[PDB]
Design a binder for this molecule. Structure first.
Ligand SMILES: Nc1nc2c(ncn2[C@@H]2O[C@H](COP(=O)(O)OP(=O)(O)OP(=O)(O)O)[C@@H](O)[C@H]2O)c(=O)[nH]1
Ligand SMILES: Nc1nc2c(ncn2[C@@H]2O[C@H](COP(=O)(O)OP(=O)(O)OP(=O)(O)O)[C@@H](O)[C@H]2O)c(=O)[nH]1
Ligand SMILES: Nc1nc2c(ncn2[C@@H]2O[C@H](COP(=O)(O)OP(=O)(O)O)[C@@H](O)[C@H]2O)c(=O)[nH]1
Ligand SMILES: Nc1nc2c(ncn2[C@@H]2O[C@H](COP(=O)(O)OP(=O)(O)O)[C@@H](O)[C@H]2O)c(=O)[nH]1
Ligand SMILES: [Mg+2]
Ligand SMILES: [Mg+2]
Lengths: 48, 48, 442, 430, 442, 430
């Protein structure tokens, strides 16, 4: 079985994920939705 | 139908190896101990 | 975009089987060359093109030749499972081996076979639009690999000219040995290989045996394991051509960054997360841990100790989920270490590459599945110790002309031994001179 | 008053794609090219960066050049990639190999005529042409060599206009390429003769901006290229919107450059602040002015405390009083008076524009001319001297054809630039 | 925040099993290292971090190495219940024992194994960001404990430098004995331990046997009871790192408060509410009674009598439901007593700690459940009597060189005995001089 | 007239947390920062301790410093902790080791520049700056060393302002730390030169207040820190509310300090009385004055009966007649005339403030300058001399780098301070 990888760190082309049943080892990095335009454009995050 | 449990993941790659007969009598094939084991492990199916 | 693979002799063909198995499994091509109907893509993609060409009916075929003087290994490929993948014309086999004689391969027997190989390579190069180098796999210990590999590289270098040629080479191990005449063949091979290759990567079976005993838990390894590790290394180095990434790396930048002087082109190779499945889930594998690992001698695939020399350049290839800030922090930490030393004339010692595709896991394989890996190629003065022991063994046998009558009967002047031995002596002196500190500022 | 942009190499093309995203957003241009904005202020200066194609559409006046199409195929696949004119993508068939001489002499002369043909076609279409804008890295291969080649040709063809560059320069701590000192030295040699204004960025400074100010856990090259696109789109804001005190690139040059060699500047952009902290501090002109001079907010590794300001410029966007701006610039000059060159009576120029970028009440971009830039050039010259004495990788460049005299000329010119900064630093009235 | 545990030889590994069972049960880690999947407290607090690191899949793994020269004890760990908790690389075992010879461990056999230990400790210390010491468990009576403890502490002290090293050490009991050669090994150990340890905790098996007879009602104790008590003491000292409290105590504060001069670092340990379940429901257990208890000679875990000396410093750790006023009233009451004496140069004799986490109850355990406990570590001149008795036994054996030929044959000069015996004699004189009361009036 | 607060070490941060609870309660600021008060009198001086953040919110002008974040994590986790500005939390990665020399010389100098940068950022925002306020213990390690370091830096940078400290000093009875005499002696040496006015509190006096006056069965550090927060918030009350006879920190210093070294004062707060008795006796100025001079209500171990008052001040909060205040202070001075130094014709200053603390009809805080403080310093000097003759723990401090001459200098300075107090106590006029 095969699937399609996501693109969290960038990129535009699709990538192939081989054998998703096997769970990868190692630590998964810490991620958040905080980006640089959310910080440099969304000053109206609070409507006080 | 591979389960995501830890032990199944640890032993799945070993189970599918193409050199299974060459591992007999070593610490990999003993499912009752962690690897690099020191004690005796049998090498015949009647003893195993 | 495209690269052509040339496989010579026994080690090179057997490593080729593992390489093409891996490249098939990474792209998803079935062993018969037909893409399955389920492996669909949202948008049309070209990444296979580096290694496969389509006939138009949708069969895939690979950009490789298999060259041998004995039939048995190529007949094994023809009768095996991958029969339909290769074009049958691509698989060229002679009648009889070069019998561990460099002279027999180069002068007597390879001279008949070389023109078919050149016609096949030309036929490949005509079906390209951005060829950007040759990858060559051979061993210098045997007769046909040395003699025909040298003759073929000479012809390629005249016909194609400036195009880059990168070699993966299996050198004679420092105490494991398989044949008596290995030093003579390795010296005579290395003399021709010096002029006509841009970077040469050195491998020793004793190191891969040590790596499979120590890191993996394998008591009785065999050549299929070593060949699968080599295939993984080649896939890591060529991944920069095939998938999206932050910092891509074309094969010409390797030649520009790693080679300081035109003779100083022999490089060390290492691979970080060689680990078994049971060990892999007890430990995290962060960027800094694998970066610290690749500089430890326990990670290397060649039996040399880099603490006895100085680094000139390092090229670090990261593939998988890695972010550049951790690579920068790791390299700065490595630079801080006191047991890692660079020659004072090379201040900017590092090259980095970062690719998003994580390393593939092969169903019968012995490596665990991991989210990230790093691969290193590095230039270091420690390699001079490797040549000195081969030269000492050559001197021991040659002082009494121990085997020379075989070589003289198959067509070689006695003078050629002394020329090659003097060239290797000059290479040793080059490695002595480049490593000497310049401190005459007055 | 329209600018023509050139994007060269991997870094330049990547930053450019994000820049044109920001600019298309500010003028309300749909990725199909249709104008969809909501105020006349957006439309009335759209000509500055876009040309109008038939039945609604606007096309951006930019040339994309690279030696291998990989980057172009990545940008074409992006969300705004369709807007670019197909004829404006120029590419070869083999890479630069990270070699300046290859990028400048062998494939450069092969491609350069088609890029110059496109640039002339774009320039002669303008009713009045303003300066060129170029994005490239100095450490690379095709970016440095072919960018400076094109710059030299445009300076030959348009010597009366302004030439402005944004440029990425090697970090002091870790190299991304082994041969960086040669490529940097040769590129600075070309720029100091040809350029009118050159902006410099350290990737290490952007990492320190992200980690200390924004406290990002896992920054990516997209964030760094957004910061650069923000400053690039900010410098031109007074060209294209109304304000109480208009300003212009030529007016910036006249106020910033005391002597023609002293044209290398530091950049900053002020209202950077983390999502957790934003609830704790309102925007005001004193806060922006205090943050604006903090070296934490400066995009180069050299720190102002080791040098002196010859001149500086601040461009303010938003509805604000002129009294607060003039009195803030006076108070900052008086309280830190030892860090300002004394034979100039006022070092800071201000400018005010009515229209801020969407979703910010106010913003300022800061450009500074400071003598601490000499430490970067000195560091590069040191690494060059270590490499050059031993001919460490020189055979590649000589095999392409360069004479060593080019290397000795470039070293001498950089050393003279460092000497000139040091001399003006320690000058006195007597 | 972080601490690394090093377990050496038989006593240290067996005490380690009790320590890690206890630390698991206090945090709530299952024996397989996974957090309970049905537990949803939500406040996923960081307190484990002192002893555990995460892989990222949510398995827990502990910061420890197990070192032995004989396989049997490590194979017991490998085949036991906690198989999945430890990383297999962490469990290091040699081929053959040090045969009760300090010389065999230090010179002949430990020299091969020692580099693996240092590589593991480096790999742990690299995966830290606020390491604040090493905890070491060993016995000085046996061969591997003596030889590898000295060699490993010497190497750690050169490589890591200023980082603190705290040892919990089982010394040869004053009349219970297990091997004939114990005095020689203890002298040779103490010579190395003097230079290379920051605090030394003193234990005697006869005291823990007496404590289990008097307070608990156990006629027939075994090693699991003693090891569970030791684990409780270690948990009490390290609790200050792991949970909220009124008066915290960092590991550097122990060294600053307990050690007046750099050689006078050997300390006594005791624990107050050691009580059985049947007695526990008949009595209230207030602060002042247990504070009075820790000073009674029936409470110590080392066979020494404090009435024969003077205290220099005391560190009192309270854990559980305690209020500072009760601690202050208790310490002032202790200070009033006439049979407790402090050296006149130490007027502010006490250090206090108050922690909110009550002591944990172990499913198979023999201690009752109690809301509060106090633990004491104290520096006292009475310890000089233990050394005097070891030295006297050494003089009796050494007058005829009774066993020395084993040590000299296995690699040691005879001179090393006299040097060590003179150094311990000088330590006795140091304890004589520090305890001198002098009148500056002159 | 705005104060900047600094909280240092565990004791200082906890007392500070209780102080900001009391002050936020008095001005009716919700823990979200929203104003919820019920009179304009609360709003009209909020600026004195709070800065205003955007859309309603108020933030407290305080810097928190510690070497391990455990305390910082506890205060951030507390019920009002959210109010504090995130950028204002400064912490290191390794402890003071309960060692003054470590806290002052090794980890101190590494962090201290970032603390001064934050304090300057906070100070330069004020329109007119009044003195600083610092809370720390003298017996600790980071509290003593970094508190006195920071005091020295702020006195260099702001020498014309006021420097105020609240300080906890070791009890003769509660030995919480073995090395208390060294840290106390070195810190008092730093304070007597650097400080303008320093307040001292004994934990033993707070315990005796709680047990005897309030008859609390089971006191905790929350009660002691509430008592301290009450006096701390009381001293500044006249700065920030109307009254019939206003007073100010500088006016307090001018009336209390006869000579510049004699600036260490005792504190008290009067209407402490158990909830059962309070229904039987109403508050009045004779009652407040009687509690005010009763040594039971004084926060030091030294008793007034062993010394003499140079000066004292009483600040009254509430609606009350000035006549009662005037006659009580005259009657107390005349009736106990032997305990007041005779060459000053009137020793007591009074002040009256309209707004009492909530739920009390009236309150007074008492500050007293009494020579009996000399007995405390003598005790600390005694314990130091006992410890120093034998070099009891000195190798730790010498290993950090201190010269032994520092210990003899600090001892000599404390001995001269004790002698000077004794000399003015026993002076006479013939
Ligand atoms: N790693 C690896 N080494 C191999 C393999 N096959 C052979 N070798 C090694 O390479 C050397 C032998 O070279 P060969 O490839 O057998 O020589 P040849 O090319 O067959 O030349 P001829 O004998 O004349 O046919 C020995 O050192 C072998 O150990 C292989 O499949 N993998
Ligand atoms: N508390 C406790 N003491 C023990 C234990 N095992 C051994 N001892 C004591 O420790 C001393 C013996 O030390 P060992 O640990 O056996 O020595 P070793 O480390 O095995 O060294 P080798 O004999 O060379 O392998 C004697 O005083 C024993 O009473 C144990 O499990 N618990
Ligand atoms: N800020 C930024 N820097 C980049 C980016 N891509 C590459 N670089 C930097 O530019 C340098 C490499 O130059 P490169 O663009 O590859 O040169 P080229 O090969 O001639 O195109 C290195 O210092 C990289 O870190 C990017 O997207 N953003
Ligand atoms: N009143 C009061 N005293 C405290 C508190 N915490 C600690 N102390 C006292 O302060 C002294 C310890 O100083 P400490 O704050 O730990 O010094 P630090 O390590 O530098 O922070 C001892 O006398 C403690 O009794 C508290 O919350 N309230
Ligand atoms: Mg063969
Ligand atoms: Mg044993």
């Amino acid at each position: 079985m095969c699937s399609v990888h996501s693109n969290p760190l960038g990129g535009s082309r699709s990538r192939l994920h081989i054998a998703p049943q096997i769970i990868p080892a190692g630590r998964q990095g810490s991620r958040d939705g905080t980006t640089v335009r959310e910080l440099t454009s969304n000053h109206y995050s609070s409507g006080r | 139908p591979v389960s995501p449990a830890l032990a199944v993941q640890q032993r799945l790659i070993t189970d599918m190896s193409s050199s299974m007969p060459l591992f007999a009598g070593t610490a990999k094939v003993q499912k009752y101990a962690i690897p690099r084991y020191a004690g005796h492990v049998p090498s015949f199916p009647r003893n195993v | 975009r495209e690269a052509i693979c040339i496989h010579i002799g026994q080690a090179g063909c057997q490593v080729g089987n593992a390489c093409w198995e891996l490249f098939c499994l990474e792209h998803g091509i079935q062993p018969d060359g037909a893409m399955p109907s389920d492996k669909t893509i949202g948008v049309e993609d070209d990444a296979f093109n580096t290694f496969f060409s389509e006939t138009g009916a949708g069969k895939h075929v690979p950009r490789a030749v298999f060259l041998d003087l004995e039939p048995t290994v190529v007949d094994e490929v023809r009768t095996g499972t991958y029969r339909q993948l290769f074009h049958p014309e691509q698989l060229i086999s002679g009648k009889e081996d070069a019998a561990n004689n460099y002279a027999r391969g180069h002068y007597t027997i390879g001279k008949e076979i070389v023109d078919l190989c050149l016609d096949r390579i030309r036929k490949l190069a005509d079906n390209c639009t951005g060829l950007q180098g040759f990858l060559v796999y051979h061993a210098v210990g045997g007769g046909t690999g040395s003699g025909l590999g040298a003759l073929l590289l000479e012809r390629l270098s005249v016909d194609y000219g400036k195009k880059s040629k990168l070699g993966y080479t299996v050198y004679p191990s420092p105490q494991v040995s398989t044949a008596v005449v290995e030093p003579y063949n390795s010296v005579l091979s290395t003399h021709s290989l010096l002029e006509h290759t841009d970077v040469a990567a050195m491998l020793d079976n004793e190191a891969i045996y040590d790596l499979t005993r120590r890191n993996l838990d394998i008591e009785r390894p065999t050549y299929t394991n070593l060949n699968r590790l080599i295939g993984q290394v080649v896939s890591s180095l060529t991944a920069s051509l095939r998938f999206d990434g932050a910092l891509n790396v074309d094969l010409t930048e390797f030649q520009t960054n790693l080679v300081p002087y035109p003779r100083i082109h022999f490089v060390l190779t290492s691979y970080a997360p060689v680990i078994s499945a049971e060990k892999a889930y007890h430990e995290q594998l962060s960027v800094s841990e694998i970066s610290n690992a690749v500089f430890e001698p326990a990670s290397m695939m060649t039996k040399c100790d880099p603490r006895h020399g100085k680094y000139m350049a390092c090229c670090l290839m990261y593939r998988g989920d890695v972010v550049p800030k951790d690579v920068n922090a790791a390299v700065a930490t490595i630079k801080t270490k006191r047991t890692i030393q660079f020659v004072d004339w090379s201040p900017t010692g590092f090259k980095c590459g970062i690719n998003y595709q994580p390393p593939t896991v092969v169903p019968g394989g012995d490596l665990a599945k991991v989210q990230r890996a790093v691969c290193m190629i590095a230039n270091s003065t420690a390699i001079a110790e490797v040549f000195a022991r081969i030269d000492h063994k050559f001197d021991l046998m040659y002082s009494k002309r121990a085997f020379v009558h075989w070589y003289v009967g198959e067509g070689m002047e006695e003078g050629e031994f002394s020329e090659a031995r003097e060239d290797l002596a000059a290479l040793e002196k080059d490695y002595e001179e480049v490593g000497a500190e310049s401190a005459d500022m007055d | 008053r329209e600018i023509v942009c050139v994007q060269a190499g991997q870094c330049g093309n990547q930053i450019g794609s994000k820049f044109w995203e920001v600019i298309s957003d500010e003028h309300g241009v749909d990725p199909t090219g249709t104008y969809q904005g909501d105020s006349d202020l957006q439309l009335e200066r759209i000509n500055v960066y876009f040309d109008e194609a038939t039945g609604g559409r606007y096309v951006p006046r930019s040339v994309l050049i690279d030696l291998e199409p990989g980057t172009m195929d990545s940008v074409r696949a992006g969300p705004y990639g369709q807007i670019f004119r197909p004829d404006n993508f120029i590419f070869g068939q083999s890479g630069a190999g990270n070699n300046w001489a290859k990028g400048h002499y062998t494939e450069g002369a092969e491609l350069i005529d088609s890029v110059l043909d496109v640039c002339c076609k774009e320039a002669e279409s303008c009713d009045c042409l303003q300066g060129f804008q170029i994005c490239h890295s100095l450490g690379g291969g095709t970016g440095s060599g072919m960018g400076t080649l094109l710059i030299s040709k445009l300076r030959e063809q348009y010597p009366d206009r302004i030439m402005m560059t944004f440029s990425i320069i090697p970090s002091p701590k870790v190299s991304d390429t082994v041969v960086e000192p040669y490529n940097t030295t040769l590129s600075v040699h070309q720029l100091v003769e040809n350029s009118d204004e050159s902006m410099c960025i350290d990737n290490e400074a952007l990492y320190d901006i992200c980690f200390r100010t924004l406290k990002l856990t896992t920054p990516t090259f997209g964030d760094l290229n957004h910061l650069v696109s923000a400053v690039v789109s900010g410098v031109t804001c007074c060209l294209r919107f109304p304000g109480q005190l208009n300003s212009d690139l030529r007016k910036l040059a006249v106020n910033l450059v005391p002597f023609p060699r002293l044209h290398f500047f530091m950049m900053g952009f002020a209202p950077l602040t983390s999502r957790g902290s934003q609830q704790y501090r309102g925007l005001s002109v004193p806060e922006l002015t205090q943050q604006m001079f903090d070296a934490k907010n400066m995009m180069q590794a050299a720190d102002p405390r080791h040098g002196r300001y010859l001149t500086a410029s601040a461009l303010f966007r938003g509805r604000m009083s002129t009294k607060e701006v003039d009195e803030q610039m006076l108070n900052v000059q008086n309280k830190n008076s030892s860090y300002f060159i004394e034979w100039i009576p006022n070092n800071i120029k201000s400018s005010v524009c009515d229209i801020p970028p969407k979703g910010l009440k106010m913003a300022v971009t800061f450009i500074g001319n400071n003598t601490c830039i000499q430490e970067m050039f000195r560091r590069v010259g040191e690494q060059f001297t270590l490499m050059f004495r031993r001919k460490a990788f020189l055979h590649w460049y000589t095999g392409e054809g360069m004479d060593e005299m080019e290397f000795t000329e470039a070293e001498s010119n950089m050393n003279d630039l460092v000497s000139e900064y040091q001399q003006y630093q320690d000058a006195t009235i007597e």
